[PDB]
Design a protein around this nucleic acid. Structure first.
Length: 110
DNA sequence: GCCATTTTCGGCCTCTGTGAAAAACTCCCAAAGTTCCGCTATCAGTTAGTAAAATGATATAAATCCAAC
């Protein structure tokens, strides 16, 4: 099933592609880790998810263990490639001591 | 040269513990000490972020080599 974020981007959890409607010619390529993190965010629309829980769901299914700086770097690359605001709450933000938040709307294509 | 008064010495080791008298108050003033509170510096504890380096994984190109005709 394909998801639409903030009526602007479209993304699918199964093929890991991003499409911007403003520039439909340029497909945006994302890494597997950030794509799975964003999909997990989309599964829970706009409610807080713990850093610990999202981290362990993303990487323990991968079969291997990494430090928690990897999560921060993945979110940094997610915000950078999406051209989301550096620290304003436009699409994705970080809520301290509680976890991570998404602001973009969820539109299931099918 | 001779009294006549001072000065100077008198063994080594070992344990040992000393409190033991003695009688004024009063007023004024300045500085140190005690305490409380506020500001400031300094550090542990924690979280998150961004750019870059490091490292591994995959990709792309050949060497050659081995089996079948």
């Amino acid at each position: 099933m394909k998801f639409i974020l903030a009526e602007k981007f479209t993304f699918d959890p199964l093929s890991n592609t991003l499409i911007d409607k403003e520039d439909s010619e340029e497909i945006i390529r994302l890494g597997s880790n950030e794509s799975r993190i964003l999909w997990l965010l989309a599964q829970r629309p706009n409610e807080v998810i713990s850093r610990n829980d999202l981290h362990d769901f993303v990487w323990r299914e991968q079969g291997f263990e990494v430090d928690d700086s990897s999560l921060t770097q993945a979110i940094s690359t997610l915000r950078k490639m999406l051209k989301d605001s550096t620290k304003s709450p436009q699409y994705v933000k970080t809520v301290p001591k509680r976890g991570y938040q998404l602001i973009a709307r969820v539109e299931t294509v099918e």
